[PDB]
């Protein structure tokens, strides 16, 4: 979430990111319930106040809200104890932010995201863009390994595909920012634009990428002015599920049919409907590709036709249980690197060695009944030395 993204930041980047135009307001809206009230209170105070007052300024009931809000805003570093006055820069910017100093667009965003997903899946016809392809490849959801051949889809790719559009886009933009820092694009400048949307060379490239994603559209041969789409700020279902593992989806866009075929066997395709079967073969194929039953169940539930909304639960218990059992049927091997010792002599002496590999992060599996500790070869030169020291101590 955006709260996680902002919490994972340093004070030096935080105060700079608190730009005058929008950031002080976008981060304010994040404040879930009560911290808004305290920010408004001590927006006009130039004198810090004791912490005991803030502690006792919430009744005994519902105090956990007080502690959680205080911790969240301490992490955000909106104020400092100074002994709880707010940061002067944030106070000034917030005062400046508080009395101081379309139908075609949504369709465009939908179509652009749909073609992006078409390219993501193995669609022969899709929009071509080398920058988009390499960005998706380095986002961790795609791997090519061969420039001549079109890139394939990794295991995480299917999971990302089956996610809903809001979370899908949000995670995609999170990965975009994380890779922006790697490629060298300043994070603060690009981040501030997202906040400003909900109200330079790097800016131009970032806006080009956003337009490729379909969140914005200049509409004037790439002019300075832009008109953000609905997705920039941040529908009825069509699938009918039977009790015999049969799906009737009122789908005209090929994207939905492809998504359904990812985990179902298609039987018929009518102009305004398509018939598929959820069989062991298709479900286990998806599970092997990497999906888990939770994504499939959530996808079918969110794309649930209004006819089956009346029944509770919306998705039949037999179908849900069958999908879950099919996914459980498979349990899979793992991969790690390690080295094992033996002849550990005294018992109380083996317990002290277990804490050496656990603190360094090179321990995989321990055994106090046989004395059997696995150590990765990456930290083999540090565990052996410790063992030698212990032997010397005797």
């Amino acid at each position: 979430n955006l709260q996680e993204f902002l919490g994972g930041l340093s004070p030096g980047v935080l105060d700079r990111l608190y730009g005058h135009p929008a950031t002080c307001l976008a981060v304010f809206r994040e404040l879930p319930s009560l911290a808004k009230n305290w920010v408004m209170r001590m927006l006009f105070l130039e004198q810090p106040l004791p912490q005991a007052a803030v502690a006792l300024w919430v009744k005994k009931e519902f105090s956990k809200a007080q502690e959680e809000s205080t911790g969240l805003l301490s992490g955000l570093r909106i104020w400092h104890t100074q002994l709880l006055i707010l940061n002067p820069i944030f106070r000034q910017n917030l005062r400046i932010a508080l009395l101081g100093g379309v139908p075609s667009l949504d369709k465009y965003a939908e179509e652009r995201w749909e073609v992006v997903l078409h390219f993501m899946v193995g669609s022969p016809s899709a929009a071509v863009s080398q920058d988009l392809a390499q960005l998706l490849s380095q986002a961790g959801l795609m791997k090519s390994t061969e420039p001549g051949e079109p890139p394939c889809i990794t295991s995480a790719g299917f999971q990302f595909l089956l996610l809903d559009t809001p979370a899908q886009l949000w995670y995609f933009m999170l990965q975009y920012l994380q890779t922006a820092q790697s490629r060298g694009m300043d994070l603060v400048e690009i981040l501030s634009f997202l906040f400003q949307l909900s109200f330079s060379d790097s800016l131009l490239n970032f806006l080009q990428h956003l337009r490729e994603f379909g969140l914005v559209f200049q509409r004037k041969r790439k002019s300075r002015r832009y008109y953000p789409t609905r997705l920039a700020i941040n529908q009825p279902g069509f699938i009918v599920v039977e009790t015999n593992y049969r799906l009737y989806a009122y789908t005209e866009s090929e994207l939905q049919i492809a998504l359904i075929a990812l985990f179902s066997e298609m039987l018929y395709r009518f102009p305004n409907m398509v018939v598929a079967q959820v069989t062991r073969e298709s479900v286990q194929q998806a599970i092997a590709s990497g999906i888990t039953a939770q994504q499939i169940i959530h996808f079918l539930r969110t794309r649930a036709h209004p006819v089956m909304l009346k029944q509770t639960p919306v998705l039949p218990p037999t179908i849900t249980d069958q999908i879950r059992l099919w996914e459980l049927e498979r349990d899979r091997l793992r991969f790690t690197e390690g080295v094992l010792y033996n002849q550990f002599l005294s018992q109380v002496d083996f317990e002290l060695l277990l804490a050496h590999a656990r603190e360094l992060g090179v321990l995989v599996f321990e055994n106090s009944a046989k004395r059997l500790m696995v150590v990765t070869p990456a930290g083999h030169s540090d565990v052996k030395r410790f063992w030698k020291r212990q032997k010397h101590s005797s």
Binding site: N342, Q343, F344, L345, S346, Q347, V348, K370, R371, L372
Partner: protein, 393 residues
Amino acid sequence: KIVAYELKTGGVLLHPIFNPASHLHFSIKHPHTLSWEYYSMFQCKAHLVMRLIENRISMEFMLQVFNKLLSLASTASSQKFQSHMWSQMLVSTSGFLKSISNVSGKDIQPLIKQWVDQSGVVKFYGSFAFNRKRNVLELEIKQDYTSPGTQKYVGPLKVTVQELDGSFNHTLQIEENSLKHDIPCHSKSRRNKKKKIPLMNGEEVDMDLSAMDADSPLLWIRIDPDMSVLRKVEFEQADFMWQYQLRYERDVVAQQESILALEKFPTPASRLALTDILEQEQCFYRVRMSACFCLAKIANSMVSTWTGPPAMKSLFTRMFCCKSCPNIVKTNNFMSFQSYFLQKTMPVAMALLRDVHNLCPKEVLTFILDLIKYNDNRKNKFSDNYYRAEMID
């Protein structure tokens, strides 16, 4: 005794050649210049080297050597010629080796050259590792040959490995550049079924295999079990292997060395092992007398963990006191000669118990004083002087 003396000061040189031994402060050319401790260790090393010659050339051939010497002497002892034949009553080293070579056809000149003419004992440091993939046991035996009393051994070396399929002997060739010796290991199919594990002798016993490793079949290893060299072994087993070697071995020197090596592992499984040795008649009595002192040392080391009464007290009241009165000792009947020795050695080890304050507990001192007060010896056919003297000790 001899490895302690030879590592302490130089070494004992049987058969010197005329100084041959300059590492020690007296001359070994005459018996009246020898130190008395050197004379005692000389006789001790001489009879151990004769046991080694019996190990190479069997005991019946050895008794035939001695009978040939005695028979030459007794044919010599009846002549009247003034020493034409009376010098057959005098033995030498060359005559003894020649009589050995006459009766057996083997000469012992490497063994004589190593253990007589050379004046040193050997030190063995062993450690093992079990290779689960190739099912082998990789021993690692290194010698300390740079100490002042030591020498380098290059002969063969017997090792006895007790695995789940039984006890197997292996001969290792320990040349100068040798360090790793790979010996093969057998199955672990006596852990699949509960079957009895066969011992060094022909018998077999039920073992509790819960402490054993799941991947290794081997229960214990003994480097040079028959004491066929003049050696000091320092083997690094795991503590459960020492406990299995204390419980189920049919060799008293291995039970003694496992008692000696269990003092470094104060775990409660070792306390259970020594307590099961102490309760066990049909164990040799000098092993139980050592297990008393080992149990006292282990009990001193695991204070602030010890649960019930002090060590060996409940065991003393179970073995040697009345059934109706626990604190009154039974009247003295010393006719068993093994529970007499164990009874007179158990409070001596029990008095080495110490509390968290480093003072002997007043539960053991009161127990010893009640052993002294309630002592009645008007009924046995044996005297009480050694038992009362051990009570004062």
